Design a protein around this nucleic acid. Structure first.
Lengths: 285, 85, 115
DNA sequence: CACAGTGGTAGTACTCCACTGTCTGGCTGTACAAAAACCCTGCAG
DNA sequence: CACAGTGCTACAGACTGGAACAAAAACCCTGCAG
């Protein structure tokens, strides 16, 4: 006469095949007339509200947070920050991720490849920009990421050695990215000013402190070559202030000013080399 | 061999140096033929006796090198007091 | 003719009511014919196949958190393990704790004094 | 008149475990309107 | 034959779908039995 069957939440997800057939068909039939392929929402609005029908609220918080705002688990930007800024090795981070996931999870942290995929936005060679007037003797391509700083040394044996390894951002790109990163603080500074928005967009002035200093006693790696000296030179800048001038009169008007310029937190590395400060040759190259 | 000079020699540059193919880049340097053969042969002797005291438990992992170690060392010492005296 | 129709995401509950009335009724009727009428158990299960038809992993997680569970708190010993084994400084760790706790927290990590 | 840390403490401060009633806010069936934003068609340049 | 990693790569593994097979679970049943 059939068969007694125990409740669903104890069966495997597979066990289900039998139970939703009619609902899969009904949602499919439904989707064409009112949307056309919008799968997410039909399920979402019936469900949240259906729960709060025989309601204790407890769930409404967890469910209303569940998709678009915010995280649920933790938004990959917050993860990325909580890796980069507490100094976790990538392998160390993943180590932790595995641990928190396996034990009582409900994993919280986001996996590495989705951190990497959340990365491309912060680094330079991402945000579009254009220069008026166009820059002299510089490429107009704005997508360039980390560039080997050798910058076209022909590495011909006959010539000066190519020995030194380096990496640098293309200067302008590094600028527009570092600075667009300040969009938040510059807009909030503008609203503190209670200053006009649409008008006076173009009168800005940006003051950049750049610094370059040498570092000795840096060991090196066996590696595949090329041979390179021990000492390393780190070229970096920092944005000290950003101000406005238009309409006219009014001095120049500060908006954002770095509060603790001596902090590690604000210094922007640009060119990293292995070079001794003493040899002028490769340094100017 | 992709190796760079050291002041004090770490055991890692010792593991790259001890291998036979490392003794190959040097075998090319020594003009003399029989010398070239001698130190090469020496190094292979050394590769044969090294895992005995390097490996955790040779009684299982590397039995044959262990049983032949006395004879192998004999051979070694002979070669030293022979051409290198 | 008719007004330029809705774009989901913009409204409060009772436009929502006849937006789905007939499907909620079909569901009531279903729960009734085979599963007596326990809507909570029915509705929670509904999401999974529509999502997991072509999906994430994230879906397994967010949905897996539900009513049972949980965590609650990672046992202080496990957390401690994460700390000394990933080489986290107390101030660095506490940094992480504060950060994960303020955002979406639901604090996971256990505080210093309990460690 | 760097700066971003470095762990233990004692400080403070806040926010929790039982006993209870009482409260507002919120949901469920259809009925009842008034706004909401098109597009109609209608009447006019 | 020290060992915990060192990031980004490689693509191994984790997923759907109907179309249909089969086995097994645990009921009801009828069969042949004291």
């Amino acid at each position: 006469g059939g068969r007694p069957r125990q409740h669903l939440l104890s069966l495997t997800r597979r066990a289900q095949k039998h139970r939703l057939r009619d609902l899969k068909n009904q949602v499919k039939t439904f989707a064409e007339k009112e949307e056309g392929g919008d799968v997410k929402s039909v399920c979402l609005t019936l469900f949240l509200l259906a729960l709060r029908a025989g309601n204790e609220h407890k769930q409404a918080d967890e469910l209303e947070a569940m998709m678009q705002g915010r995280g649920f688990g933790l938004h990959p930007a917050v993860c990325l920050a909580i890796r980069v800024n507490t100094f976790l090795s990538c392998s160390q981070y993943h180590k932790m991720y595995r641990t928190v996931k396996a034990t009582s999870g409900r994993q919280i942290f986001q996996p590495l490849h989705t951190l990497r995929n959340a990365e491309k936005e912060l680094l330079p060679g991402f945000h579009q920009f254009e220069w008026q007037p166009a820059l002299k003797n510089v490429s107009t391509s704005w997508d360039v990421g980390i560039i080997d700083g050798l910058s076209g040394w022909t590495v011909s044996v006959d010539d000066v050695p190519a020995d030194t390894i380096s990496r640098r951002f293309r200067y302008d790109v590094a600028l527009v990215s570092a600075l667009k990163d300040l969009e938040e603080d510059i807009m909030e500074g503008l609203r503190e000013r209670a200053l006009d928005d649409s008008m006076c967009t173009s009168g800005f002035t940006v003051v950049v402190k750049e610094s370059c200093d040498g570092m000795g006693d840096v060991s090196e790696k066996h590696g595949s070559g090329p041979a390179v000296p021990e000492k390393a030179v780190r070229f970096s800048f920092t944005i000290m202030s950003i101000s406005i001038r238009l309409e006219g009169e009014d001095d120049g008007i500060t908006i954002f000013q770095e509060q603790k310029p001596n902090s590690e937190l604000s210094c922007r590395p640009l060119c990293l080399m292995f070079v001794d400060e003493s040899d002028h040759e490769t340094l100017t190259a | 061999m992709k190796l760079k000079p050291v002041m004090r020699m770490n055991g890692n540059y010792a593991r790259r140096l001890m291998t036979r193919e490392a003794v190959e880049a040097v075998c090319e340097l020594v003009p003399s033929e029989e010398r070239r053969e001698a130190l090469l042969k020496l190094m292979d002797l050394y590769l044969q006796m090294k895992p005995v005291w390097r490996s955790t438990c040779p009684s299982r992992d590397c039995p044959d090198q262990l049983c032949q170690y006395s004879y192998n060392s004999q051979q070694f010492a002979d070669l030293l007091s022979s051409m290198f005296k």
